[model samples]
Target chain A: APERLRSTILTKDGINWYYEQEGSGPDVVLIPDGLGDCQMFDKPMSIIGSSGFKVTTFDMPGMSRSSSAPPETYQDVTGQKLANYIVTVMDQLGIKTASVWGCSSGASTVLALCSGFPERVRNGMPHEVPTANPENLQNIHDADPATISRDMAAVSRAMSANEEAWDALGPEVHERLRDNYVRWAYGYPRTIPGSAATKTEDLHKVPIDWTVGAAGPTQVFFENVVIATRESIPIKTLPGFHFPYVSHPEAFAKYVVETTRKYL
Target chain B: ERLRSTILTKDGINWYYEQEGSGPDVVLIPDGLGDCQMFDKPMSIIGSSGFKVTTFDMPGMSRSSSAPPETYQDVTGQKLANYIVTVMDQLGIKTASVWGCSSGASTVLALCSGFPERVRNGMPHEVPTANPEQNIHDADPATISRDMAAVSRAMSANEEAWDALGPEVHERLRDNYVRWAYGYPRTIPGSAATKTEDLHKVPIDWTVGAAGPTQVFFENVVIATRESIPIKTLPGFHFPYVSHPEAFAKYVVETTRKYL
Candidate 1:
């Protein structure tokens, strides 16, 4: 909140795009994970923005303040639709190019953005990007709706300390955003994979500092995507939960800003 | 008034909208340039004047995000009308006046002409030069350059082509429009008819700039006003909102109230 520039909902290229910017220098757009909106990056944004970088955080379609017009395309809540919307936002704000960073499901969106619109994204940090952990999908899909609801309610209660952060994801964020999450998780393989024309040269050429944080599942799944993309690299682990930026802003901001500077 | 901005997902597109103030709902469908930024000042004015103003970008224009159509033929008045209903439903409003300026006026006409039940009233300004001869759609292939910056300014004012998106998105916009507005379906049947037929059935309030090509469309039935006096003028011969927002707000609020 220190170097706040402005906040507004921009409808660009058909997505109800919501973004917040602070400071001014190298542009970095932060993408939040599933069920979380842009506000999850608040601490890191304040930290990174103060470090002389233009930090921007946004809610993807069906998450937080953003929405989708073409309802049928909601299946693309994380793929090309979100990817293209990022480019649309940058264009509207007069940003020629920007570095992109995503966490968890958001990391998937960063991958989608990197692959789909490489020209617009200077670098991408898909932290804790997972493998095709179809198990989570199966678990959620097989459970009674009440089971998943109870689980989310538990997580929501656990996250109560950061209550205002939840405000980013409208009132029924879990309900609204997770529906798209279900669709994305259910249809990702066919809808997203092979959609990106990510060439091999650019695979390693693009500055993708793939990161993992704290524990397994996400921490362990990082290698699968790295291997699939044919980029062999160590998954740098940060000591925090799934949202490292939210949990460890100082370290996360230093890493994000430093890594972004390498590519910029 | 809670300034609300939301996306309404319909059939296969997202309608990004911003609404503010409260009273009667008035939908502002902008012209081709489709800059939602232009409506801010007017939105507040009319919004404060016993009216809730909802402004949105046209398909693939400005802030309204557009997905590639499943097919080009879907670009019709019916398709647009369905999306409008989707937007209205999202806002939880049953009936409201629909207003359009320039080419946007044509779209509002399309909505009113077909789905008159959804309309409380219609305000169409600068009735587009719609006719068989007017549907000339072509880009000078020779001058067409994939050179992003070159094609941008070169095509910016080139109403014949897709240039409203400036440089970064012109190519995408071209691909998006080449088939419809600038190509085969250059003109939808009855879109021109929406203007010709007795719109009198829909309580139409048509306004156009007197100095521009407006008189060419309407000898009477149209309200002609002079430009210059910014607040009361129909400033933007093509983009009244951009040229004169106060005038645009006045025209919008006055027309809708007069008919209501």
Candidate 2:
């Protein structure tokens, strides 16, 4: 097993990010879903790292163990900001270019990085991207807060492939989810403005491989991402629920290794 | 506005079909899993443009009777090809142009192979021709089972899940997914048995969506150029007709005009 190094870096925006790294090869950064932290990549990081590639996982600003955003900037955390933090962390780690992968809202960050910072990415792989259309976003925005929370909890449980995987998420992940549910819910309308602004023409600047959980509830969202990107990207369906890394780590790691191996 | 819908029975299976306009005969087969309605918009466009166009729900598909177990066992799509001939017989057509996309495209190839005399011209877009390297049916059964379970769970989650896809797209996917969740086969059974040699037996014109997923298979297969079939790279994804019906209709009309 390769040695895992845990460290922290302060971005230019003054936000501190905690990241983990392992192995020694081409860089592969795994961004956590918006509702999750880097710990979600525990199994994948190990498997992918041991497979002759350097794997990095990080917590986005103001989530889990990472320090909270400045009060003034807290409500305004956009996908671009999150994407910038990825580059800043990469710069600190001396990684000039790397293949990046993210799921759910984290996939939006991958899209933002691919479109906003194409030069820094070798390729981008986004899984189960929840890119909502305007009507859906408005519907979510207008719904009662309590109803949103209830549905979110129920949906999260339903997204788990089995009870054991759900339980393995642990107390820390649950607590963070509870605390950030509102922020996570509101993040779509704020974050998607920039994501929606991504031009289809510009997407060709970077190579992108889109992924979807074969049985995830968010296939519609993934479809919207494909259509918005003009269907130029190759799409792969991996077996599992929404959090495939948690439920099917071996399959997830195999995809990461095989996909990244193309650019290398 | 001119459309005549009818039900025709063949081999104890009730098949639904529709015909509009009157001119050169053209039969449109929906994707194996889809119903005739998927072709409603484009059917009308092509039908009205100086061509008599026909669209039908395959046996055991929507608005049609369920097929017997044996229908699925024949992956050569020869069984499906015969059903189309039955429909053509009912419509009083002797021979006509045939077109389909995706698995429907595979069906087009089979029809051309099995009943060359009936097909004046064969048109297939984004054909998922059998390739050993990227065979979709070779996927792991465990993975397939897991995906089916997940899709079922996601559909039962909440109404919010369907909002993004809108009602129409959502409904179509649900129809397909429900069958899949309930153990209906995803890939058409035995479709891999479709031989490339069979496709060369008739006058066939192929279209590949420039941005569609099937481009790789199209590029890899040597049959396209060797058979001297005119392969056109069209713009848009798998269901281009849904997104740009007018352009799609024009292209179909032009191709049929060329061969008819």
Candidate 3:
């Protein structure tokens, strides 16, 4: 109708966060990982919507389409910041309760959502939750920015590697940098270790499902397996490794339908 | 800081690629059916390691927009090499390391063969060395095309069936596989397999999945005829980058640092 109804709005903190919604049925909010945003979830959004769900995707502040907050704004914030941001997003959409699906950093946000506002969460299936091992703390957090910039320079040179280029061009591109560094850092403790068991215990209070795909890093699947096994949480297994939404949307969506019915 | 999307128009096709990071350049080509997204996780890991990563979709596939060629018959190793260089030139990257998977490994081979100077180092994984001339086309042409088309049609029409394999497999089995199965064999111009010796000059790391289709040309390429580096097998399926991004990224970083 309105050119596919591409959606964007300002968050309460006054940042231009981008979001998109499609299909019609029950409400479901989609959250992406570090260096990820709503546009990247195009395929998953479509597949899940077709299976009878309203899929809404958004870029967290400082991630992709969302404008960067003051540097200090993100430094002090982590999981609760993400949870508050989700509240603003859901409030803006007028959604009181919805099923949530997230992976990577997004999965951590789901935990934050459960911890802070369990009432709003009907059910959740967070994939590849970045927990279980302590080494991942260094692997994702301590990565060299200079090297990342170097690699991005190569990508920028060869293709569109930033928001400017993606906006100028037509289709969806990859996520940008800077904010990922800050946000991914916050995502870490917001849902793990000192705070993880508590938030996950809150998560367990509701209907919950966890998932790990084939061939994913030991750190990702490892933590998911540990949480499920230790807490008696049911974990679903699929074939497409880490980013099943991108790599295997149809199957992921099918699993969503089945699991939502069984657990939610 | 963020990896952005860009489209480069070459030969009337909009070549879609995601660029990010900075350092010694690395161009990652997808194996089959996948586009820039296939390399997303690994790119993040590799990019953070200080190596520049440029990932692109091949012609007439997902992410990239192109009118299907009348026949892939015209696609050649040399022509593909020119396309790679042209994309690099547009981006002002003079020389860079190259990495590829599945069918993309063939593109890497062609790049090494035709434009050796531009290629600083190469990582070709799950490389198939079988010569097409061996009439490897022995499989019944009828079953090959028909079966893929049926799968494609079923997935398009039925969501239940699509769920069986997932989107990645569906695209490969249908869009990518159908075209290759229907258009290749008869259309592939070269009968000769990639020469193992041609790859000896460049420092290359050859890897494959430990359990997926075993290599049939190990003797032909690594042992007797070609002096390429010894094959290194890793645990995983065809796409290691997808399965194990952190480890794969570390491997890519260490390899490029050592060789390139």
Q: Estimate, for each residue in B1-260, the C-alpha lDDT of model 3 and write its tens digit.
A: 64666555555556777787889999998764435665777788888878788987766666563634741334544545567788888877877788876556666767776678878887777554443432443466556545655643432223343343457644544455544654443423352226665675666676665434222223222321134364565555456676656767877788889864
- Score residue B60 of candidate 1 by CA lDDT: 58
Q: Give model 2's DockQ, 2 decimals.
A: 0.07
| CAPRI level of candidate 1 | incorrect
**What tens-digit string does per-residue lDDT give for candidate 1 at A1-264?**
356655665654566666789988888888776654676676778888988788888766655566544454355344556667667778888887778887656777777777767777888887755444434344554555556556555554343323444444355555664554444443443344334423454355456776655432222343333343345433455545466665567878898888887866
Residue-by-residue lDDT tens digits, candidate 2, A76-173: 55667678777887888899888999887678778888888999999988776655544534565456777766667676677766558767879877
- The TM-score of candidate 2 is 0.60
User: Per-candidate TM vs. native?
Assistant: 0.43, 0.60, 0.45
lDDT of 2 at A15: 70
Better candidate number, 2 or 3, judged by TM-score: 2
Note the residue pairs that clash in candidate 2: none
DockQ for all candidate structures vs. native? 0.00, 0.07, 0.02
lDDT order of candidates, best first?
2, 3, 1
The list of candidate 2 runs beyond 4 A from truth reads: A71-77, A134-148, A193-198, A217-219, A222-231, B1-75, B90-260
Lowest-lDDT window of 10 residues in candidate 1 chain A? A215-224
Leading candidate by DockQ:
2
In the range A86-105, model 3's lDDT, one tens digit per residue, is 88878888888888887766
Interface RMSD score of each model: 30.7, 11.5, 14.8
DockQ winner between candidates 1 and 2: 2
Q: Give the alpha carbon lDDT tens digit for every residue of B98-201 in model 2.
A: 88876677778888888888888988876655432323445565554455435433422232432433556444444443343232243443453245668667
Candidate 3 chain A, run of 10 with poorest lDDT: A154-163
